[PDB]
Design a protein around this ligand. Structure first.
Ligand SMILES: NC(=O)C1=CN([C@@H]2O[C@H](COP(=O)(O)OP(=O)(O)OC[C@H]3O[C@@H](n4cnc5c(N)ncnc54)[C@H](O)[C@@H]3O)[C@@H](O)[C@H]2O)C=CC1
Ligand SMILES: NC(=O)C1=CN([C@@H]2O[C@H](COP(=O)(O)OP(=O)(O)OC[C@H]3O[C@@H](n4cnc5c(N)ncnc54)[C@H](O)[C@@H]3O)[C@@H](O)[C@H]2O)C=CC1
Ligand SMILES: NC(=O)C1=CN([C@@H]2O[C@H](COP(=O)(O)OP(=O)(O)OC[C@H]3O[C@@H](n4cnc5c(N)ncnc54)[C@H](O)[C@@H]3O)[C@@H](O)[C@H]2O)C=CC1
Ligand SMILES: NC(=O)C1=CN([C@@H]2O[C@H](COP(=O)(O)OP(=O)(O)OC[C@H]3O[C@@H](n4cnc5c(N)ncnc54)[C@H](O)[C@@H]3O)[C@@H](O)[C@H]2O)C=CC1
Lengths: 405, 405, 405, 405
């Protein structure tokens, strides 16, 4: 304590729940910033920080990282991590954590909201009325009850959209490359062409990979029904946008709602441009599918939590660049040791304790191609432990070591 | 039999379902127009029409009414009846029907879909995207789940909305002038000003009358929760729009969705205007709160129902310009008499039967200020019912009479 | 008022809500008894009572009734009415009311409770342990989730059992002689033999009529599956009990739960006897399917309510021995008149008013084979009304007449 | 391959599902008995058994354990393990498995079905019917819906019960020693004495330990609601039965249902006794709270699972007499070592590899007071893994070792 000494750098305004999680766990040394940092402020604030929490805007680059001399772990208080040089962090024994599934509710809700209005032609009607034009009609406008919703991608987000969708009395269909257990009354469809053929609304919730690239093409969309609707709040590489423009202006689709795009304005000052901008029957949203207070508080708890666990017990459960290891806290003293993955290391580490008659209660080592990470609980008094820490460090191939408690 | 001679006039493209169930009832004499008729064509095609179904643009004026020789009843295949001269129709013993509550589901689905998006600031963000501005920001966006919906007017629409909002995880509170039995875990607040203080979202669902006129004024809006949303898809008299504008401008409210206005464009070619058109964080819809295909079908089944029933059995249950009468069909010949509300008419009608030894089985007479309407079941031959009808037709004060069967 | 004068006799301890309903409506002249009355106390308490409320134990016999000289209406605060001489009451113009559907919840709950334990062999195990015998086994014992429940009789009770049954994850099947709209996920089965063939538990909810007499016979029960269960909380004539004994002792059925029997102990002191009494795997209950506080308070409100409505406005909606008539309360003064169903009466009644220039606002007459009942609102001051009341009485065929307000 | 040589012994008629999923895993060497084995047959059929699955009557005693030459692991296909000598099994490096929570649904369905009937006084009324007494009386019978269920111990069973009780319309409150996240609209009461004051039905679902021993004593029972019900299907230590008897006798409680007792009959031929056997308004069941066919199948899938896993990959996750170890299967040859918990063993094991240039990929060692258990993945040939195994087997302190693959 010596915890009043362990420093937390937090940028881009994470949720205050992250901060109150740290305090609750006795970590008060917090430097907090609402916005993002230029390099000279970043390189300067980070250099004596044991942990950093950032969002999607800060680039933790190989050099920024090597400029940080006391850095123990990194927390992406967000989903994405590409703003971070994982291999750079990993070579310095710095694990990186994220919040992969902490805003599925926000995405599910957005698609409900959006399909209701698109079904009803409200976006077109809303834009028209902001330009003085009144357009009252029932023809072409539908209720949601009794319509068939097709979910492409039945994961965390796809499944919970399913539930909200039944609650409103929609029939729910879905297609995954994996077989899944239908929830509520949902039905899996074998071929995508059949799902497309009988859905009134189609919503995509797939990840970003060669199999999902331009997955919704001219061909696929020609397979949706006349007057159907396409929503993409997944990833911007998933839908062929020019194919969709053609489909909107020929009126094969009645509308659409898009949140993610092949290229996205780098910041809020840069211009947004898309051929879909000229259609009033389309909703366009600045990749905000997950951008809520509720979600921002979820991520702030999970990721703040994840950092505290690692500080307090060395858990790398769910680290994205690192060997996963965690150990239930039972007995004696905890140490950890990150090193190059080569023979003899673990035996040298344990030999430090066998030689002097010290018992080892538990140990967990896991490896990646090039690196090994181990946690040991040993039974000894403070002194012996301080000293073994010292000896652990000298082991050929040692990257880093720490006495946790 | 007789049913073939009975001509039905349908204008303005009512729902096929009206034709279908008129047909199932044994009514096949039908002139159907998907469009509106012109003075010249209306007056020549209604000349021999026993019934007419119309929508919102056909104007049933005393001129037209008094020319239509054979007319028995009118059906407004809509909620409103301002297009029809109710007083003239009444004067000729012609009941007017409509469908005040066949729109319930469309208005509720609309309120939900709007409150989802406003909470998320999507309308404003969509507006910005369409003009090339990217505004990615999670501050101020909220999930719907966990928030408090405050419903004013817990009737047909209020209650069904509360159900949906509970399926979304919202907490449902309401305020009404009389005491209501709550559905699910909704909660009646006894004072309005508490209902407004606590609500994240307020939605109005009340009639148009002296007591609701500008009921949401500056005072009431100033009581709503800071950063809350107001939604009105009830009627256009109900909310002071200028005061709503001030509330939005000062940022006391974070948005609204208005579907009805103090005055509305008559045609669709007519221009629309509103102080609220200056806000991107406001949804403005052209009074389409009930404009769906499903609603058109509800209205179609129900109003045809009401005409078929009035035809087959004289029921004026739910007529809007008329004494309400209904009588279970059990026995004998049923006869119908419409007359001036003055002493002695009822007696003379019944005397036709008493004096010739004919037993009366049922009779229901109700009155308006000015008119009497009475249905009668008698126990007699066909001949007798026929002569009776003739005598009835000559009772002083008589407006019209009919042998139903 | 003159309401402090109108007397209510209440026997057999109806729920106190009935009493507080009467007070709320200004009727305080209440004689209340917990138990039932012998004839000499009954003939004596009833003779000056305008209304009586009884249960299933008091026999209101033709003579008891004729002994009551001020009796206006009868209320069966229960379902059954056979304890009452309907034709005797009806010939004196006394309508009889009941509570036909005010305990469906109590019956639905009982069958849930009972099928859970029967599935689990708990009744047998419970009786065994009260005799010192411990019998722990899993074989033959099942959970309710995933079992198929067959409802024979999908009415008020059958439908709500369905809902409770799905809540527990049972598959719900049913058979009715009428086509019905399935609730939740319930399925109608065309032939009874198929329902019997695939139900794990079968529960009967049919009325008492020639079509339901011994409906469950040896034949039918040989059609249930080995180890299935039969529950009857409908009527005692519905199930062939000796057929069921044979089926229980051969173990074709694993158990049963019966609440109603062909003959039932006339009172609580008389001996109950049945061949099913020797089976521990059978539940036997003293026709208590509907016997709850909740139900007793429901019936007390409905029936007390029904009496007050008739006193206050002459409504005979739902009277079981009487012509149904009711009139919305609009204008002037209300009178009612019960009479023999013969020509001339109604004309004489209305003539009383036509002759002196008094307007009639509304009238509702309805008839049975032998009797007519009419309600009239007329527009006159107190005096004219008192007098017409007097004249109404003298009309040949008049049974009874009353000035309500 | 090897899997054929691996003999599985199943006694006491476990669920077919155990055989099925053992088979799917590639394990077909199976001796199955639907019944219990006698000393003489058990000891000769287990002699070469690699695994054994048993129930409650087979007594795995140190005599049997130490004779069984080839035994690797034991599976208690039940919740309890008192029949197995855990300490002896541990001493020989033989883990014991069971299924503590495969019974959840059966106990909940039981509590519901019992609370339905007790509220309705059916047990007492059924008891009377069976001896020829008819007791038709609605006073004191209540519907379940609207009443308050008070759950003590909101774990696996507590929570799932609260869900069912909410489907029945009951209000769900709970009390637990640590803070729980409520499901549906359940409500955690912070003081127990408030939970007891307000409850109409109390149900206990807590472990057997020093803190629960007679936790429902005279004091606690006297705090329950007058006319309330107590249900215990947790464990027999938890409730003072004599004091429960006094509460029932004084009519402070209106009934109870007890499934577990301070001592229980061993065989089914043994006699049962309880002061509570004097009450008709008490349900007594022979500790069958989890005795269903479905539970037998759950337990069958799960325990076989645990044996198959320990076989295929060494996981001792959830073993009851053993260090818990689990390791993701990624690379190389996996080896397993069980030994005395004393300095120097770990080091010698790892030295076998370090000194011959063999890379260690993962390792998980956990310890009990007295024993060490460690799994290891190495990067080496088949020959090498084989010689290694031999050397490992000779490390001082070694109890047993195994080349998993
Ligand atoms: N719009 C926004 O602001 C945000 C976007 N997302 C994105 O939404 C997507 C889904 O997120 P989660 O549901 O949590 O991911 P998930 O992994 O839980 O769901 C992905 C599902 O897609 C299925 N799938 C993968 N490839 C497929 C293929 N090519 N064809 C058909 N099905 C396929 C997988 O089997 C899996 O079930 C992700 O790409 C995520 O990044 C997530 C949060 C916010
Ligand atoms: N946007 C659209 O196209 C449509 C608008 N509507 C309008 O919606 C409104 C509500 O419709 P329904 O629920 O069907 O009507 P409803 O008659 O069923 O419900 C009206 C409720 O408001 C309550 N109420 C009356 N005055 C009140 C006051 N002063 N303060 C608080 N509560 C009051 C009444 O007690 C009643 O419960 C009506 O004005 C109707 O014309 C209905 C359908 C479509
Ligand atoms: N156990 C008790 O303490 C009580 C018994 N009951 C009895 O339960 C029965 C059902 O009550 P409710 O559901 O309110 O009556 P209900 O009339 O609402 O339901 C009767 C249903 O049975 C169907 N049905 C009639 N005859 C049939 C036939 N022969 N074959 C197949 N289906 C047939 C009808 O179509 C109708 O849907 C009644 O007999 C009632 O008296 C009701 C309350 C309490
Ligand atoms: N009748 C039967 O045949 C069966 C009996 N059981 C018994 O049921 C009991 C509960 O089972 P599960 O819910 O699976 O256990 P669980 O471990 O999942 O739940 C136990 C809960 O009780 C709480 N608790 C512990 N001590 C407490 C105390 N002093 N006061 C209040 N709460 C306390 C714990 O925090 C935990 O939430 C166990 O004793 C188990 O052995 C389980 C299955 C069948």
């Amino acid at each position: 304590l010596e915890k009043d000494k362990i420093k937390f750098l937090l940028v881009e305004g994470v949720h205050q729940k992250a901060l109150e999680s740290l305090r609750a766990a006795g970590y008060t040394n917090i430097e907090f910033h609402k916005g993002a940092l230029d390099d000279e402020q970043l390189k300067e604030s980070i250099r004596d920080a044991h942990f950093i929490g950032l969002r999607s805007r800060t680039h933790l680059t190989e050099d920024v990282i090597n400029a940080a001399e006391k850095l123990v772990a990194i927390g992406a208080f967000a989903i994405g991590t590409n703003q971070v040089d994982l291999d750079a962090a990993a070579k310095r024994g710095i694990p990186v954590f994220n919040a992969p599934f902490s805003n599925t509710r926000s995405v599910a809700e957005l698609v409900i909201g959006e399909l209701l209005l698109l079904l009803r032609g409200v976006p077109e009607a809303n834009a028209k009325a902001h330009r003085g034009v009144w357009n009252k009609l029932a023809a072409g406008s539908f209720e949601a009850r009794g319509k068939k919703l097709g979910i492409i991608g039945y994961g965390h987000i796809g499944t919970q959209l399913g539930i909200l969708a039944e609650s409103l009395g929609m029939y729910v269909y879905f297609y995954d490359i994996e077989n899944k257990l239908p929830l509520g009354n949902a039905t899996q469809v074998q071929h995508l062409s059949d799902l497309l053929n009988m859905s009134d609304v189609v919503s995509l919730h797939v990840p970003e990979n060669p199999s999902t690239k331009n997955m919704m093409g001219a061909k696929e969309i020609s397979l949706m029904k006349p007057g159907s609707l396409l929503i993409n709040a997944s990833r911007g590489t998933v839908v062929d946008i020019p194919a969709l423009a053609d489909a909107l202006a020929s009126k094969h689709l009645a509308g659409a709602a898009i949140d993610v795009f092949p290229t996205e304005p780098a910041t809020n000052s840069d211009p947004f441009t898309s051929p879909l901008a000229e259609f009033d029957n389309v909703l366009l949203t600045p990749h905000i599918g997950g951008s809520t207070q509720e979600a921002q508080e979820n991520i702030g708890l999970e990721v703040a939590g994840k950092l505290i666990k690692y500080s307090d017990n060395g858990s790398t459960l769910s680290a994205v660049n690192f060997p996963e290891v965690s150990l239930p806290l039972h007995v004696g003293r905890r140490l950890m040791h990150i090193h190059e993955n080569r023979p003899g290391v673990l035996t040298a580490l344990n030999k430090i304790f066998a030689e002097q008659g010290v018992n080892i209660a538990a140990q967990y080592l896991q490896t990646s191609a090039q690196m090994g990470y181990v946690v040991i609980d040993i039974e000894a008094d403070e002194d012996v432990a301080e000293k073994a820490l010292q000896a652990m460090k000298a082991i050929p191939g040692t990257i880093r070591a720490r006495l946790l408690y």
